[PDB]
C-alpha cells in the first residue's frame, strides 16, 4: 500500500532528515 511504501522509503531512499 502507498503509505506503507512511503514509510518504507522513509528508512531506505529518504532525504528530509539526514540534513547534515
Amino acid at each position: 500500500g502507498l503509505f506503507g511504501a512511503i514509510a518504507g522509503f522513509i528508512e531506505n531512499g529518504w532525504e528530509g532528515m539526514i540534513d547534515g
Side-chain angles (χ1 to χ4, degrees):
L2 203 71
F3 204 95
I6 276 165
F9 150 88
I10 236 80
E11 282 278 63
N12 179 248
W14 177 238
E15 186 55 283
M17 207 176 179
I18 325 86
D19 179 31

